[PDB]
Design a protein around this ligand. Sequence first.
Ligand code: ADP
Lengths: 316, 274
Amino acid sequence: RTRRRAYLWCKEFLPGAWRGLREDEFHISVIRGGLSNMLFQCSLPPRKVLLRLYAMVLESVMFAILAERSLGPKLYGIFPQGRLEQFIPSRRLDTEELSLPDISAEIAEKMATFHGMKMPFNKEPKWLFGTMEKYLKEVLSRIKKLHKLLSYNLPLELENLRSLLESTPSPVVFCHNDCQEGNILMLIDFEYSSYNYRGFDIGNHFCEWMYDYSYEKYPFFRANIRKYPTKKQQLHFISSYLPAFQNDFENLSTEEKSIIKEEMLLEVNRFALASHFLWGLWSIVQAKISSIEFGYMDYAQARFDAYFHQKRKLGV
Amino acid sequence: YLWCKEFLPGAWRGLREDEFHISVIRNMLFQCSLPKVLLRLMVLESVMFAILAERSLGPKLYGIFPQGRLEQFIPSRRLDTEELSLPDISAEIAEKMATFHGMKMPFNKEPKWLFGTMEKLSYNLPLELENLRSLLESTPSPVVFCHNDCQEGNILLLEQKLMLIDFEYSSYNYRGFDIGNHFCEWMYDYSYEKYPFFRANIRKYPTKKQQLHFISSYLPAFQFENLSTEEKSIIKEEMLLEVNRFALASHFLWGLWAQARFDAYFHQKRKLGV
Ligand SMILES: Nc1ncnc2c1ncn2[C@@H]1O[C@H](COP(=O)(O)OP(=O)(O)O)[C@@H](O)[C@H]1O
């Protein structure tokens, strides 16, 4: 029987009707069936709950806290396999919805709210170039494809970037770091969340207009470089973002306002380069150490070609 | 620090060593301050500490990472044993311990922690835990979010005079245990300079009157407690059985891996009827 454990958690953690409720009447339905996150719609007929099984205290102290602040589902029980999580009738929102004005703004301000937070995690801005440096080292028909990636001269370019981004001031704030369409229901899943350059969070969100992972045929993803936010679009994100992040912002002069936004367009767009390089690196390492399923070298090539395309567009 | 400078905001990022001074206090406790925070050197306790922190009924939480934590330094002395009997303190601890109980928490609601922990000289035991289980296996006591460690040296008289800290042991448990365990603490002084570091007295244990002025403060801060005076007495009487029998749990379990807490457990065994 599929419900093998399941019943045992829901009876034990959820109070009231779940307290006595016999096994003959435990109704569970699968929602997502993953190798490192299975989802389940356990209920009774808190009437329904979301079971989510399969160094990191981060994305569980995080989840808790957002459940305290009404900005995430409630935490109805936690245990070393997963958690029982409030069910909210909801769905992942697909890549094509991100450009909507309705949804875009919201995300911009929610990401501003997120960056606003002050949290009990390491504040040393290590995550970005510490991870990238580790992966580049690690890296050094597949055998074939890797060469074409490595022929780009990744070690050099990585310091070319270190240079470029070190010239680009970006405030250090608690970033989500994976703010793409499949993590917005409300903004969820903090696997890779940490303190980081705000630039990365945004630019990585922009990069994310290009890639759709809703896929069951290899390579399991689609890339549309002609789908990155336009200038007007970017600005508009930033201008739903700034007033949600700086209380002082709305009363600045237009030269002040305009100067910021001008400077922030440069910021997030140079950081978008980091998103291509980080994830490009990440993907290659997964083409080896992955029990998941995806087209990781293809994804790599996609991320890298963007990266070189990207930096031609910027001209520096 | 590292650790401190790694996690704290402001001047802390700019600090160096030597330029920072900690100060040992008790695994270990520490006391770090600028040229102040508590340094305590897994996931499940972190989730716990933070939620409590978030409900502003704990010290502030600044850092949390695998082998430890960084907390609000809360200017105060800790109470000593003799203060506990004070009608005013005892009452406040009863109102505090009550809310701490009425909190929803994301953990196991089947009391396993109690029996489980005990499982985990000439005193030949386990067959004693067997009565101790069966007996308490009867006693109905509503489950709640228990502190599991209400000693004087865990209650701060800060400079509503007090709040409670140090919840390393804060499981879900039978209400009887928490309340009862606190009562057992009136009997144990963890002062005394000489060996064996403590003094004890079965007479300092709260009387019928004392533990009642206590449990009549706790029920309002829990419970509408408009209910008839006769319904309140039945609630009180009710709870005494539970409180005092579950005080045997207190004694016994407190054979932390010397301290003849047993001598008392056998005592309240005669005194109880069972
Ligand atoms: N609290 C919740 N209540 C109801 N449905 C949820 C909840 N969280 C996630 N889901 C469902 O799961 C999908 C997203 O799952 P997600 O957690 O992003 O995947 P993964 O399990 O691989 O990390 C959405 O389509 C949504 O319907």
